[model samples]
Target: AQNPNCNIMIFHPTKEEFNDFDKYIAYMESQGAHRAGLAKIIPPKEWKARETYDNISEILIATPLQQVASGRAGVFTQYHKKKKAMTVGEYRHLANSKKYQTPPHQNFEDLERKYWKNRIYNSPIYGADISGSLFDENTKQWNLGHLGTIQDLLEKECGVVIEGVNTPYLYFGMWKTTFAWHTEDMDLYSINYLHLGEPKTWYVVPPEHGQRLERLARELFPGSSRGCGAFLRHKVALISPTVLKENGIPFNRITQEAGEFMVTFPYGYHAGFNHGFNCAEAINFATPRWIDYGKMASQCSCGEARVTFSMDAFVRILQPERYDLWKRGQD
Candidate 1:
């Protein structure tokens, strides 16, 4: 009994079509996929993320974090990453207990499962840099545009390479284990590829409904919203599209499958939970279109003046660099 504003669209490009990133995305943009703010692409049939060495241990894998959060409660401001390899069996048992603190049932029959999936987030695992992808570079062929859309202007204009921005990060998620609602850092576009396991469910609102959703979120938790413009950056604020659409907000829902790609547009508000234990790789990227959103947004939602992307310095140096090909001559 919830609203479905519109199912944006889905694409199944041919091997050739998918391989030509520029041509493929150009066609996608022509179809107004950019305007819709979300595009679901099912890659070629032969493409598979079938490579691995799952013996992860003694790697200082810390205690997976957890907290009971709510629309009324605002953010889970308390957590520690400063904390694992052995007793993963015990660790998972601990996650099962944390589940009990929650009494469950708010929206769906299995609502508890949606928000209560506990953690084993293997973040910042770099393979290609390095990336979350376990597929060896020598034999892989599926060229996922993980590093943003086509020409990520960030790397072209700025010499600095950001990890999650220009590079990719892998994630490990399970049923009900969730990533809450928020925009990509600095309002950049993000492309997520689910390498394996069950489908990852997602709910998103285009940039147009951002204000309406933000207004409701602000009212839902006064202090949380009052303290910072980018309070959602805390990654604790979440509102079901059910509540959102019922309140006249536009939204779309999709279940992203393994080997599939989900693109979150600039300023596109999104959040969702996993269907089951899975692995995904996502990276932040920018295009010509994101330049405006990047400029309009702050360094971060929490007033952290961290330099995620330096557009000013990029523009200034790019002008002269293009003239002399200065960096090129050194190589």
Candidate 2:
């Protein structure tokens, strides 16, 4: 079925606007970009992300795509098909396999845990929890941290390295693969850039409709986890925009092609699916105003999703940094 109309704003950022974070955001606000939960930026033609996808894609892995699309848990435990570990190249080729095109069932617990474990990235090259920052890689000449347009104040102030939050985490996607509906951790702002490959369609709902979306989800997924507010993340539900519309939920979509940036606002609910083989890198950032949004997020629970860092402690660090910057300006 065809999707609904896209309402998110798109911007063509000037070099100066792209380099200075607030400058671009102020202009974005002027255009009422906040009315939608997300925005897209098409940077100068000269811009590009210099990350290692070719090297990383060669990393070994069992075929999780089948397990991923099943949406049924423990596909691994039940079905031990005759298989040797294969490279992601083999997995990407499975785009033609056309085996599991059903709603991103595998995106649920199967991939969710794999993604969650990425927080500690100690496992493999793909996860955020793995030791080093993507920006620190010598090959990354155009790193997200280097962008003046969307600086991460929490990381800058606290000197805290948050994997996938402040740290760029890699995502490899093939056609029909999905990132289920959910908000960024602690309701922080998230910016995702398609480093290379095909387009990804992102669906975002306005922040004010947050509870309305939850109510619809609870009504839809009664068998879901206890906290319906947390249902989006826990169950990995990817409700179609058609379903959302029927539920009277409002949403917008934008296709994120290579060399483009998509930013989700704090408390903004979002979800999407990939078109074809693609590599996207995403990291979360918090502006000073995110403090209140973060507090509101804290009232809900992921139920079992472990938080990677202490939100309050980081806030404590940011408070002093906020003062230091303000005090210097006053003087």
Candidate 3:
């Protein structure tokens, strides 16, 4: 079924000889992936549920790449374009609200902590943990499922077309954040970009820079001691405060221009440069099925399957591993 939160179509594909669609169905089945197709995915409050089920064909079809957009423009446009006028207090509130909650799953925290780790991100409930300067009222204005127009412009400029076929709408939503660390989720490529406030720095170790990263990871994370394996470091795109330029590496300054840059989020882990301003934008593109987020009703216990299908479908599809050796600690 197409999740409105995903903004893509899903469910039964139209083509008669759709073996791939069948395989996709089989994949969800193999992984025990839940099927909300027969039942209404959205509660009585949201009418879009019916719209989603009716357009199943568009959902399951695969599109190579599609660009989507959303942000606080309607009323916040003035704040964003002005850039410096916005503060971190105004920035995070919108990022951590239900108005902008992506995935629509109010409690997808379990899936997040399971698939993505902690240092990388704060869950949707991020607001719940705060006090004082950490909480901002402007954030409440943010919508979880809206798109900012800049995404469309960038895609058009790059000759990249954004589609919902077979892929779940990753960006263009409310509240949903990602694993802040360098990590991968299947082979689904994401167009990662930033907007407004500048990130202190962003890190990218192309396919060729493996050895340097490995050495650094061993010294920093210590896999043998952590009991997680030799700190798994793969080629990922990262943006954070301390990532320094090595050998005068070349990279376009998304922040310098418009505080934006597009990254083909590799199927691995990585982090982003944290920001403390209003109108911050972090966008993504991916297949819905490639990523899994379980739905929840109550705050504590897991909800009873209102729609009786178990997650017997959805199998894991690992990408061809990208090998890299870390240089061990240069920070």
Candidate 4:
């Protein structure tokens, strides 16, 4: 291959290596992945695959957030700080019907105008943003190296950093097909979720998808993707090596509880990877900026962090500090 120095190899584990879900998570973490948040499967009990596998690893919990829908809004854990507990019906209505209009002020240079006025984004190309929502003014809103911010906010997150301005980091949380094919402004750190040790996360990324992602980026960030390397995210989970070899699907299926996985990025071709179970998050694209804050990224870590935002995991970190209007005691 052209400019080939290191060969990127996909790892497939054998039945003998099949261990507990935690081990699977640990293995992925050892490789350089990070957590977006935490998830508790509904019912708070042990569960087996509706299908037949040699081992059982999925554990369901009775968390209030897990009671929502699948692959949709409920799939993500929402923060309750904004409006007191709203029913799933209400949440869905608000999420779908609300038209996110852009702020009257498009000039990012004017901090005052941009701060008072917010924008509503419809395109998924820009990722998720917390403009009119509850959490938006945090330092780690778009920085790739802030696990501490996610930990303080989101109940779940996940992914791996194929590349970035800072440490190559990956993390996971509660998100799924909601993501699209795109890359970061700088190098990117991708976030994703796991579907309880299924055995494989099949992905077929074509060149067209990468082009589409770049187009979306240009529309939002303008010239951001030109010099910056771009990547595409396929919403696939981990697969079992045996299943992959026999079934011929390229993915790493997750088969255990607390079992999450991730893949390093910036490659041209990808098929699949393996994972354990009970993991969920979106394929997020982020680039580090050149501002200095007490947190990992700097104060300049701001942009179209996401196309739209509901409950930002990063904003939760700022609490009272980000919003000077909020009462200190409430924070």
Candidate 5:
């Protein structure tokens, strides 16, 4: 039977000293797993994840024009200005560029503080971007030491490792800053850790009902007067749990607090916004079951049917060795 609940599940490690990566992976693949739940692991006692960042406000303040140009660079460190989302590069550029200097009375720091304090449309700070690598970093302290343990092994099992793609994307979220509704790129699993900040409220539709929710959303918020089919032509609409509930689409809400990890499974449609100032890091991973879905998602996203390492390619690379364990199992 398919899962009936389309809400976010919360996970906690059962062990007193929990570092059993395999155990966590097994649970994710199990029948009882939430599939799009939040995993609340205990962070290191002295974990000050925020310290990893430089004075970001200073970075943008000094190079406004360069930052603005960087918005289209698309490295994923995004921010918003005047309700327009751009890259951190753009944020830096906009503040420092001679063409777009910070106003005389309002410094970038003050602007950022106001943006966080007020949940207005014109947010000055927001977005998720890669800060540094979790693995393959030459320096130990610079690397995301927490994820190093199982990162390599998971990549090997999945038979696909897109270097630089596996690293965590850092987020500095303030009130009203949001991640729109979508699944992990390529439909892979994702994990988001809120290093520090106010809670983030998540609304998730499970993989089983993701398509259904999309269809309903189109009917509800069809951009054109013409019809709902235009949904595919445009980016998926971002809506709240209240809207979904009114439409009778079942979903779960999880308010992720500091030190908690939110796990999104393949094809899950999840969206959320930060309640107040906060910092986070998110990354994607794929497992054995994710192969076929990843291929499908890759095709859908870019009109290409193959992921970085297509299943056919992976099979070819691993052939000549009879690895029965690699074979797909029937349910």
Candidate 6:
């Protein structure tokens, strides 16, 4: 099921098959998340740490929603030097009333937390505590299930554990809520499981061609800066598959169904939107192969310099046993 011209692959694994994590990892390394098959992964049952909408809403309402204030240009603008934050409850109220737009200097917090059947604005409810979540206890087992033997031994010997970097995060989106085209940090792979709600349509570009794709996207919208050009502007200029096709770039499309998983490989450029109101949970993981790209990914296209974790830094922390394993495999 591998094609050089095609970057996506579909998989339909049974509950038992899906539990075989190594197969998933191998696919991700080779295919960059283009699979459109089936996995009977009901989030709650699979992870057991899944949260319901009401549960999430309640927690968000109780805590301050990290209101990410952005300008009409789609980037954050700091006016008068004040930081802004709001609660999920308030964001909903403002979103429903259609009065949520923050007039420069007027903070969004002035409004009260409101409830709604629907709303349209993109704000992420991230950093929620996952320590008590289901993944906290069982993901190691899940990873080992796929790796077969030596999963534990290899990790301990390497002193480099993928678990610490595998932080579970959540996202909340409404109709038309879109995430701009971007790759997961440091070329690390990601697994997005839609715990509940509407489906998300995804767009992907292979890692090898990501730089070229960016160059073309910039050419489409000439005046913007190198990384912040039109394709990546304020609202994220939409680059349809047709547009990419016209420009000689390759792209793959997949509409991820609920109870299904979307795996994106290292350096795969991807973007997508929610069909409607929805919530999703995602986490990042890296195998030994991701080292170099992870270094590149640490520094963002926006000129941010620094890998999330430098290879040198990672090596420094490697346990002697794992270092030997990693060293022995170096090409």
Please list the C-alpha lDDT of all candidates, in the order they appear.
Answer: 0.56, 0.58, 0.26, 0.26, 0.50, 0.48
Give the 10-residue window scoring lowest on summed lDDT in candidate 1.
121-130
The candidate, 2 or 3, that scores higher on lDDT is 2
Per-residue lDDT value at 91 in model 4? 29
Cα lDDT of model 2 overall? 0.58
Ranking of models by lDDT:
2, 1, 5, 6, 4, 3
Clash totals in order: 6, 8, 79, 69, 13, 13
lDDT of each residue in 91-139, candidate 3, tens digit only? 3445545443233223333323232232223322121111111112232
In terms of TM-score, the best-performing candidate is 1
- Superposed on all Cα atoms, the candidates' RMSDs to the truth, in angstroms, are 8.0, 10.2, 20.1, 17.8, 10.0, 9.8
Model 2 segments more than 4 A misplaced? 1-6, 51-56, 59-86, 96-142, 145-165, 225-229, 298-303, 310-331
For candidate 1, write residues 1-331 as lDDT tens digits. Answer: 1113434668898777766555666677677676556778888775654555354322222444443343232232322232223233343333335442223455443543434333222221111112444445643444443333323465555444433234566665545556767787667777787876656778787776777777877876689777776676666666765567567877777778787888887888888766545567777766666767765653322433233243334333334333233223213
lDDT for position 262 in model 4: 42
lDDT of 6: 0.48
**Residue 11, model 1, lDDT:** 85
Better of 1 and 5 by lDDT: 1
The C-alpha TM-scores of every prediction are 0.70, 0.68, 0.30, 0.25, 0.60, 0.60
Candidate 5: C-alpha RMSD after superposition: 10.0
lDDT winner: 2
TM-score of 4: 0.25
Off by over 4 Å in 5: 1-7, 14-17, 36-39, 42-124, 133-165, 221-236, 298-331
Clashes of 2: 8
